[PDB]
Design an enzyme around this catalytic site. Sequence first.
Site, PDB file in Angstrom:
ATOM      1  NE  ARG C 457      55.917  16.754  47.292  1.00 47.00           N
ATOM      2  CZ  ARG C 457      54.700  16.934  47.787  1.00 47.00           C
ATOM      3  NH1 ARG C 457      54.008  15.931  48.304  1.00 47.00           N
ATOM      4  NH2 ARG C 457      54.163  18.149  47.762  1.00 47.00           N
ATOM      5  CG  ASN C 519      53.344  29.798  41.946  1.00 47.46           C
ATOM      6  OD1 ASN C 519      53.610  30.971  41.694  1.00 47.46           O
ATOM      7  ND2 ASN C 519      53.661  29.223  43.098  1.00 47.46           N
ATOM      8  CB  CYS C 574      28.792  25.247  24.399  1.00 51.67           C
ATOM      9  SG  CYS C 574      29.998  25.125  23.660  1.00 51.67           S
TER      10      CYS C 574
HETATM   11  P1  LIG Z   1      55.875  21.747  46.235  1.00 54.38           P
HETATM   12  O1  LIG Z   1      54.509  22.358  46.040  1.00 54.38           O
HETATM   13  O2  LIG Z   1      56.052  20.625  47.228  1.00 54.38           O
HETATM   14  O3  LIG Z   1      56.879  22.913  46.644  1.00 54.38           O
HETATM   15  C1  LIG Z   1      56.559  24.279  46.399  1.00 54.38           C
HETATM   16  C2  LIG Z   1      56.734  25.115  47.642  1.00 54.38           C
HETATM   17  O4  LIG Z   1      56.923  26.504  47.270  1.00 54.38           O
HETATM   18  C3  LIG Z   1      56.082  27.318  48.053  1.00 54.38           C
HETATM   19  N1  LIG Z   1      55.735  28.512  47.280  1.00 54.38           N
HETATM   20  C4  LIG Z   1      54.925  28.552  46.207  1.00 54.38           C
HETATM   21  N2  LIG Z   1      54.807  29.817  45.733  1.00 54.38           N
HETATM   22  C5  LIG Z   1      55.551  30.615  46.517  1.00 54.38           C
HETATM   23  C6  LIG Z   1      55.870  32.060  46.574  1.00 54.38           C
HETATM   24  N3  LIG Z   1      55.354  32.928  45.673  1.00 54.38           N
HETATM   25  N4  LIG Z   1      56.692  32.481  47.558  1.00 54.38           N
HETATM   26  C7  LIG Z   1      57.214  31.630  48.459  1.00 54.38           C
HETATM   27  N5  LIG Z   1      56.967  30.310  48.466  1.00 54.38           N
HETATM   28  C8  LIG Z   1      56.157  29.750  47.538  1.00 54.38           C
HETATM   29  C9  LIG Z   1      54.889  26.444  48.415  1.00 54.38           C
HETATM   30  O5  LIG Z   1      54.204  26.936  49.547  1.00 54.38           O
HETATM   31  C10 LIG Z   1      55.552  25.080  48.615  1.00 54.38           C
HETATM   32  O6  LIG Z   1      56.037  24.978  49.952  1.00 54.38           O
END
Ligand SMILES: *P(=O)(O)OC[C@H]1O[C@@H](n2cnc3c(N)ncnc32)[C@H](O)[C@@H]1O
Lengths: 294, 76, 976
Positions: C457, C519, C574
């Site tokens: 992707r 996240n 549980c």
């Molecule tokens: P998808 O999971 O394909 O894209 C998310 C990307 O964002 C990066 N990421 C997550 N959390 C953070 C933080 N706190 N700082 C910088 N980059 C972040 C992931 O590593 C994925 O590349």
Amino acid sequence: KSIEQRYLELMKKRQFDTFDMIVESDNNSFRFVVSHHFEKMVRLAGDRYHPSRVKRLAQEAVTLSTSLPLSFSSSVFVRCDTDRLDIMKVLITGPADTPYANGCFEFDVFFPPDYPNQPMLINLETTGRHSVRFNPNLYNDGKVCLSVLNTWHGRPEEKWNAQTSSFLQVLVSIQSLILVPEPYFNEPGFERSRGSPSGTNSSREYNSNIYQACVRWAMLEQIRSPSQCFKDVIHKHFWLKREEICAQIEGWIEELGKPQYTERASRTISFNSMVLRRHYRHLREELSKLKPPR
Amino acid sequence: MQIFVKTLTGKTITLEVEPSDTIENVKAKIQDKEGIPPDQQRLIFAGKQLEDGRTLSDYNIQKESTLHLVLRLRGA
Amino acid sequence: DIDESLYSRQLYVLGHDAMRRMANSDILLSGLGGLGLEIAKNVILGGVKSITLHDTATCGLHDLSSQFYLTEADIGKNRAEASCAQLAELNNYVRTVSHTGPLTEEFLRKFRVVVLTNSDGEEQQRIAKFAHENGIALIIAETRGLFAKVFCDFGESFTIYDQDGTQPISTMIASITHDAQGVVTCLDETRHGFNDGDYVTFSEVQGMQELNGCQPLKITVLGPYTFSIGDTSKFGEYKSGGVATQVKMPKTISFKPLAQATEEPEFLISDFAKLDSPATLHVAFNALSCYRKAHNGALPRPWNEEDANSFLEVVRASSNAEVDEKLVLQFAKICSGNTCPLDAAVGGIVAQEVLKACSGKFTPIYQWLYFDALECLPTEGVEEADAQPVGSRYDSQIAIFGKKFQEKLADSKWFIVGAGAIGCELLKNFGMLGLGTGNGQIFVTDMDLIEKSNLNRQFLFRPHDVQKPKSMTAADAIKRMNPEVNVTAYELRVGAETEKVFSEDFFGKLDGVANALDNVDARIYMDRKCIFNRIPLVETGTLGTLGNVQVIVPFATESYSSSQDPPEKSIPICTLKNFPNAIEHTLQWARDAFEGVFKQSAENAAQYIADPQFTERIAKLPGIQPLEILDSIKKALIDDKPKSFAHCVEWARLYWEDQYVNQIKQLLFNFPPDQITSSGQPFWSGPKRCPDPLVFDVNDPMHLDFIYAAANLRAEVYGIEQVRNRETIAELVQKVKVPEFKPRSLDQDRVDKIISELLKNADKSSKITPLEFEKDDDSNLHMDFIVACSNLRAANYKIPPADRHKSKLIAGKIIPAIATTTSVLSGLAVLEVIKLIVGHRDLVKFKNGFANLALPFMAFSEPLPAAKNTYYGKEWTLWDRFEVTGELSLQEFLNYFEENEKLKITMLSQGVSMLYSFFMPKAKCSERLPLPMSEVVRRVSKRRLEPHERSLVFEICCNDVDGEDVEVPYVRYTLP
Ligand SMILES: *P(=O)(O)OC[C@H]1O[C@@H](n2cnc3c(N)ncnc32)[C@H](O)[C@@H]1O
């Protein structure tokens, strides 16, 4: 003043307070000077916090400074870190006419960064090094089973509600639904077997086990090695109620000495009575050494 | 009056409301029929996000109107 | 089979049947402009059998506004031929070829789906008629400035196997009435969630055994907890048990041909505030061809009044229905331009419609979709002289927005957090927009490295880029597409620990932030940073076919944290421990067992081996912690240490026995299987399933799989060479003697004794190594162990087992993702970014976006304004704050508020810390009062103040003069 009046007047001032659980360390780090179960979770969370958590914790502290339950039967004492409201320790004394009566049970509470959206984490520390299961809802590893602590589907009036649920509600729920007079029937399915002779014998066996468990861990170990946060409270509570505790334990021993109908329960009851006498001798030894508080 | 609520996953809900109910009442009826707390519900109608404290008459929600129950996602 | 190592995330969205059907479909794409290039990219990443790129136009300067595979050296060459070489590298499993000949009837017969872009009216009509007559799916897509048009014609009889893309929901049955309108009641009042008119099937029904495995039955939802299934009197009396599972019924629909559909159009609504827009846009798009025929094949000039009037007259002549004349003029004024984000979004939609045509999954567009983004234009419009071409690669964009907006874009500075799929798409769109190409800059950060599953992707990465940083590779990739882009890349994770680089100075010169994270913690942190620095933030999130975009404007809208999302669903203690009833519980139990056995049991031993002074460090720990660590070290190093692989196999066998025989026997001893409560219902009923201990059989593949995986992992933990021979392990495990099991009903001295035992008997030459759970590697046996453990526990409780695919989905917390959704939501986010850069402040212009490409569904809303609160009659929102300057003591800080703001501070906090409170000890209060606030913060937070910190943020709870609590804005404390 009556002894109950003195107890109520003396334990009122120490219901909510702060303790130095975390101190400065080298290279911009911190270390715990007290044994907290959620230290790893605290370190993993780091400095993360939801914006509403500060206001929610301030309101919770305001509520706790005045609304903590307190009575001669059972009381709740809360200590929080001097610099962090999200790290707490709770001491609950067993209610009267229960197998936990006059026993100090310590809990460790950590408020996650998502609070109040996620329920707080509470773990029982008075487990006798995981060798004692004090209640069907209190697993020997320390986990506490409550419906109010569950965000899973459940039922809207039973789940954790970000608006209505609170720390005081959870504490009261523990105090009034976990430390019940007959903890054996807390297990679902066993509740409807009450009133039968077999259910009565099973409840008597469970209570006989809990008697010695509480006498050893909730009383003797708390007197010998109290937690640094609740040392003064524990000492005052055990000094003010030594005569009542001795009378209650003597009554427990007398009750366990009654004849039993079934041999299977009789053997366990006799063994638990022997252990209870063995621990009561040590407790009587320790109580006499308690110097009176100022 | 009767209105319909479509979820972002495509499930359809039928509510029996009155032209003077408040958004809080609508969210409570939704909570009965689905189980999401009212503070986790996002109702969209005619390019507007319904906010608490108002009634359906201000948004001109009439009979057989369709509301959308949307939510945010955490992927990327 | 489908290569799961590459299509892992896409399989959870599409399915094996859909992927198999797409792997046998040939696609023809006509027109290789920006929209065609986006469609081709998304389709190739989807994984069709082959795609043929056909085009007759030659590359020009105007094509560079959206075509990222064309350069200035490609001017004069065929677009399809030029872009075919670069498009083929996206997926080696897809055969990509280029065609330049005419679209003859015999040539069209080779393709399952035909996509037409930039085709004229006569060619469109001819190809549509031929495709409908010969059973070929046809899609027509166009983009004119800020407008879009999509048409779908999938044949006279198209079958959809999964209408909506949602997993079936199963519920437990409590009671079924035996009469002519039998009502099924759910368990303990739990909502079934079944839609009205659904089809369900029954299983594990006792008494009404005839309903087991029956054909689906139409239901009637009588309430949130009950529904009717018709006449149930012909079957036996219902005893207990029973599970009703939803069944997805296929649907067959008929598509009208293009000629008939034009006269009787059915519109998919894209914005519910523009219900009259599609009717006018239909006529405008239809009359564009007539205008071109009447003006030597030339579109109306950009922002020309005479050409707009001529187009309006043509529209009036061509149709008799009333149309929005203002909308027609606006369409005519910008129809000659072209922009990147709109092309990306429409390409992502058209590619999902191509995949729908190929696989038969999800509901198609029925039949016309019309979209516009007129809010991106300035309110006063663009002057004609400002929109004239200047011989630049952004000419088609200047034809829409003008040269002044191009200058604004060139000087813009924007920060992109996360370089995943959304991050890569945002980077591409920003680069093609020309953002930061002048005195501006584009900042991108990401801490992760490229993995193979990411190539499905994320189109900016290549198979040879694995193990390289995401951000740097993405920046280098977009530098080739547009050489003028200035990019700065960081390998940092945004948070409190990286504020040295992302300081207040860094955020001070930013113009906005685009979120592409996965996240909630990073989203909350970035929202807080954008609030503090008062810069706009655009938030994007996706989940499978679902997506959303939220725009946060300073002083205008609420923040990201102002609303709440549903909490992550946990499992009761549980239920996980003793009474599981679903494969999710067993999978979580297996994950916990893996962690506890292979990681937590060895961390202390590894630390003791590595650090010579570990014992003296742990001797100072408070409470029973030194004992709890020393006994674990002893158990890991002396008691359970295996000296050979045979001991590992023996340990695996004993662990299997303990987990699946001994503990189940103990649980059954505690609760007898035939236990029945007083009122009648048995204890082992409803959500509780009566378990049965397993009997070990070496010939059973599951038992041998568990033994193999567990023994090999245990050997890996202790450094013993693994024996990956199934026959050898099967031979070894048969010699293990299983002990009989029966159900049941000074601290300093111990520390010194255990320390002496570790010093004497334990050996520091060992190589204890805790295992980190990795799901994407098939040779580490982690997923094999997880699957074996979960399936064995399910077999204990008669729960239907789950294959490796579902186990990897659930245990690994994998978020399904597809490229089409990412492209759509990035296009929408870039449109919002363009709106922000223009200078819009009214909430009417901005639009929060929500989509589900499975329905298909798209909707928009105005962002909610920030909530208003009053203290002493002064209004404030989440954007307002107090300003306290200089260096003050804590007492001076309190007195400042008490004197100026008439507020008595009862609780002062800094982040998670607590500087001051009403219940704090008197000694510490007296100590902290005369100290400066910086020193107080340093003492409370137990960390030094870095030189880059120029200000602090305080949250205060105050009481008014009357003694009542009042909410007040936060405090910005400026360090001297
Ligand atoms: P998808 O999971 O394909 O894209 C998310 C990307 O964002 C990066 N990421 C997550 N959390 C953070 C933080 N706190 N700082 C910088 N980059 C972040 C992931 O590593 C994925 O590349």
